[PDB]
Amino acid sequence: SHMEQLKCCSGILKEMFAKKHAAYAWPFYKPVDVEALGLHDYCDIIKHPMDMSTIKSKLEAREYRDAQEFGADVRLMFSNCYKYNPPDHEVVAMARKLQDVFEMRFAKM
Ligand SMILES: Cc1[nH]c(-c2ccccc2Oc2ccc(Cl)cc2)cc1C(N)=O
Numbered sequence: 036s037h038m039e040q041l042k043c044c045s046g047i048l049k050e051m052f053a054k055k056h057a058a059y060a061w062p063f064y065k066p067v068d069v070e071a072l073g074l075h076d077y078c079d080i081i082k083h084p085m086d087m088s089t090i091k092s093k094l095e096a097r098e099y100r101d102a103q104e105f106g107a108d109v110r111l112m113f114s115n116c117y118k119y120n121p122p123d124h125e126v127v128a129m130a131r132k133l134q135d136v137f138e139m140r141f142a143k144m
Pocket residue numbers: 061062063067068115116119120124125126
């Protein structure tokens with residue numbers, strides 16, 4: 036059931052926002068501030084920005100037809116990070132730790 040699936044997606048996102056993962060999830064909580072120093076080229080490289088607060092808003096406004104569409108936005112958020120940053124960047128390591136949480140929960144739902 037798509038409705039039951041989306042309740043599980045809300046549960047996965049709630050865990051990603053939890054204190055347990057806060058040490059590595061915090062760069063992903065809100066949209067990237069493209070006006071901050073070092074991010075002048077962010078909009079040139081990243082055509083579709085995505086963050087956990089936008090995904091939470093999209094869940095609340097019923098913008099995902101199913102778990103697949105929610106999953107696509109969570110993976111878009113990680114892919115933006117892997118695309119934009121150097122592979123040795125600390126933020127890329129954080130994205131990987133959060134993606135481990137997401138992929139495990141998303142697979143077992
Ligand atoms: C997804 C993302 N969030 C941020 C970000 C968000 C809020 C406050 C600061 C931020 O800057 C940081 C830079 C280096 C580290 Cl280690 C962590 C975060 C940057 C990026 C990215 N460069 O991709």
